[PDB]
């Protein structure tokens, strides 16, 4: 009965630091995915150019 209130109060107190860390984590995850995609594209392009060159 009382646990919901206690946990709710717990998640609210000084949540600026945890929110900041979580946000930074989100940003880094996005940047990671984007970099992996960029590496995939760059590798495909590299292979295609290496294919054009054999001529």
């Amino acid at each position: 009965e009382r646990n919901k209130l206690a946990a709710a109060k717990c998640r609210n107190r000084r949540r600026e630091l945890t929110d900041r860390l979580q946000a930074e984590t989100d940003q880094l995850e996005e940047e990671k995915a984007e970099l992996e995609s960029e590496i995939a594209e760059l590798q495909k392009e590299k292979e295609r150019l290496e294919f054009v060159l054999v001529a």
């Binding site: 717990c10 984590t25 970099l35 590496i39 760059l42 590798q43 590299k46």
Partner: protein, 68 residues
């Protein structure tokens, strides 16, 4: 004399709850900091690989153009 011991039990329960809260929060924060560190490292490596690939693609494209 008897209501007071029950109120002391409630006080102790409150202090225990607050302590467990603080602990769970500190573990969460620590975990998040580890994850941020790991992600920073990984993104540094990936950024390097991407930069090198961009350099290589530049060289290759320059070569392809040289034969036009």
């Amino acid at each position: 004399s008897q209501e007071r011991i029950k109120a002391e039990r409630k006080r102790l329960r409150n202090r225990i709850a607050a302590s467990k809260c603080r602990k769970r929060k500190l573990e969460r924060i620590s975990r998040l900091e580890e994850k941020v560190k790991t992600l920073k490292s990984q993104n540094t490596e990936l950024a390097s690989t991407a930069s090198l690939l961009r350099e290589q693609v530049a060289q290759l494209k320059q070569k392809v153009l040289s034969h036009v």
